[PDB]
């Protein structure tokens, strides 16, 4: 209504029900929109984000729509802190979910999680939209066990330089290809690399990648052409798929479309 752009939600329409946690942007809450609809509400800590650039990009993000992509509903601006309003993912972040051993996952379920994410990434790829920080910690799980990709693109607007470049102590070294670590060369192929690392995370039930190394050591390992190896729960066909994301040469890495086809083939073959 009056005073609100299409990308703009009225905060007054929100009822907060439960606190969900605190990240580097701060607090995230579960609540309702206009009394009925489940939403998540992420509150951006003052001073943490390039807010104007983000708000403008929010307009683009609103047009992104896929069943395996966390749906942005809108943003609450001209209040501090600003809110990001999205669909609510009841079972939380993929990473913690994988580490909960009680689930006793079948490898079928793990392959499906991979397929969930790969569908989202094929969609983003089809819209020439890079994630830039794909990892288990950023994927979410809904009440039906479906995995969706979240925080897509968001790292572009983080002001904390510990997060922003390779020479930073909070950069995702472990999810980065050699050309990112060496030259900061981002592309669809650095999203691919990170996806194979995510398949590894999934098949490893949430182990941190290169868990015995520091980031610095990991970068050296990668630069020398050494790689993550096969998780116990991954078949040879699945390992082949994740390993193919890590070709030293970016143009030799597959697309998300080819990855999806590979994953469907393995699914049919191991069904
Ligand atoms: C595994 C790490 C972890 O604990 N993450 C975590 C913890 C608490 C709350 C979190 O965010 C949630 C939780 C549940 N549902 C949703 N939707 C979210 C959430 C909400 C908003 C955003 O922001 C963006 C989403 C999509 C695109 C850009 C921004 C992200 C997650 C997560």
UniProtKB/Swiss-Prot annotation:
Changing residue 20 to P: In XLA; moderate. This is Tyrosine-protein kinase BTK. Non-receptor tyrosine kinase indispensable for B lymphocyte development, differentiation and signaling. Binding of antigen to the B-cell antigen receptor (BCR) triggers signaling that ultimately leads to B-cell activation. After BCR engagement and activation at the plasma membrane, phosphorylates PLCG2 at several sites, igniting the downstream signaling pathway through calcium mobilization, followed by activation of the protein kinase C (PKC) family members. PLCG2 phosphorylation is performed in close cooperation with the adapter protein B-cell linker protein BLNK. The modification Phosphotyrosine is found at residues 163, 229. The PH domain mediates the binding to inositol polyphosphate and phosphoinositides, leading to its targeting to the plasma membrane. It is extended in the BTK kinase family by a region designated the TH (Tec homology) domain, which consists of about 80 residues preceding the SH3 domain. Coiled coil: none annotated. Changing residue 229 to E: Defective in mediating calcium response. Changing residue 133 to H: In XLA; severe. Dasatinib binds at residues 86-89. Clofedanol binds at residues 86-89, 154. Residues 14-267 form the Protein kinase domain. Changing residue 201 to G: In XLA; moderate; interferes with substrate binding. The modification Phosphoserine is found at residues 216, 235, 271. It comes from Homo sapiens (Human). Following B-cell receptor (BCR) engagement, translocates to the plasma membrane where it gets phosphorylated at Tyr-163 by LYN and SYK. It is found in: Cytoplasm; Cell membrane; Nucleus; Membrane raft. Changing residue 154 to P: In XLA; growth hormone deficiency. Predominantly expressed in B-lymphocytes. Changing residue 225 to D: In XLA; mild; interferes with substrate binding and/or domain interactions. It is linked to X-linked agammaglobulinemia: Humoral immunodeficiency disease which results in developmental defects in the maturation pathway of B-cells. Affected boys have normal levels of pre-B-cells in their bone marrow but virtually no circulating mature B-lymphocytes. This results in a lack of immunoglobulins of all classes and leads to recurrent bacterial infections like otitis, conjunctivitis, dermatitis, sinusitis in the first few years of life, or even some patients present overwhelming sepsis or meningitis, resulting in death in a few hours. The chain holds residues 389 to 659 of 659 of the full protein. Changing residue 132 to Q: In XLA; severe; prevents activation due to absence of contact between the catalytic loop and the regulatory phosphorylated residue.
